[PDB]
């Protein structure tokens, strides 16, 4: 988890930006769910694995609700 590294919040932001890129790519051949696995699996597998594992489970939770609403808003404006 804490740190990584290097960088921090900027790295957290990359991990989350990367996960969106994997998830859209994962949508775009449908499934998603097995494909979320296959898209990660057909890739290096380290940083990516940890992000995916959370993404499936719990899945940040409160923080997604937070971030999404700020994004919704700032596409609202």
């Amino acid at each position: 988890p804490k740190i990584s590294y290097k960088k921090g919040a900027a790295s957290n932001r990359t991990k989350f930006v990367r996960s969106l890129v994997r998830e859209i790519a994962g949508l775009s051949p449908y499934e998603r769910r097995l494909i979320d696995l296959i898209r990660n699996s057909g890739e290096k597998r380290a940083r990516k694995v940890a992000k995916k594992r959370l993404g499936s489970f719990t899945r940040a939770k409160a923080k997604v609700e937070e971030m999404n609403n700020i994004i919704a808003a700032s596409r609202r404006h």
Binding site: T58, K61, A62, E66
Partner: protein
């Protein structure tokens, strides 16, 4: 009980509530605002209800909000603690839903409530914002390492029986 992934807990001895509760009744009661005009300056605005409260925080008008601890379903109040911190708007958490409704001078209970614009009480209000950070200055490491429970008498004794166990028996 529960399991649980973290919800909500913390601070409200009655003293810290009581000052905030009298300052909310005076937040409404202070009303003039006032018989002539078109434009015409306030004293008071109080708005009750979860929807009004959330909007006024996003508008950044609200000076200080109250949330009730006792809210069920839980998911109504959930947005505001995080949201208001983002905005830098202070919040108090009163123990009961009913209490919050009476002071806002509603007929019924209030889930949340706000003071939007106070009246001449700069120092005491600031003094309560500070008292409110004095009780939960916190940032968010939210919080359950799992809690839930309080153990039960037979399990609690088992805890004792296990401590003896480490000391000579296991």
């Amino acid at each position: 009980a529960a399991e649980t992934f973290k919800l909500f807990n913390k601070y409200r001895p009655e003293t810290a509530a009581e000052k905030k509760e009298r300052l909310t009744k005076e937040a409404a009661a202070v009303a003039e605002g006032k018989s002539k005009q078109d434009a015409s300056p306030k004293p008071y605005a109080v708005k009750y209800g979860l929807n009004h409260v959330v909007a006024l925080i996003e508008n950044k008008k609200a000076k200080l909000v109250l949330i009730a601890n006792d809210v069920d379903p839980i998911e109504l109040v959930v947005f505001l603690p995080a949201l208001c911190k983002k905005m830098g708007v202070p919040y108090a958490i009163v123990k009961g839903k009913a209490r919050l409704g009476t002071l806002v001078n509603q007929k019924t209970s209030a889930v949340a409530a706000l003071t939007e614009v106070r009246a001449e009480d700069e120092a005491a209000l600031a003094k309560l914002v500070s008292t409110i950070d004095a009780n939960f200055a916190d940032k968010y490491d939210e919080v359950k390492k799992h809690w839930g429970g309080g153990i039960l008498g037979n399990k609690a004794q088992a805890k004792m029986d296990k401590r003896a166990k480490n000391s000579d028996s296991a």
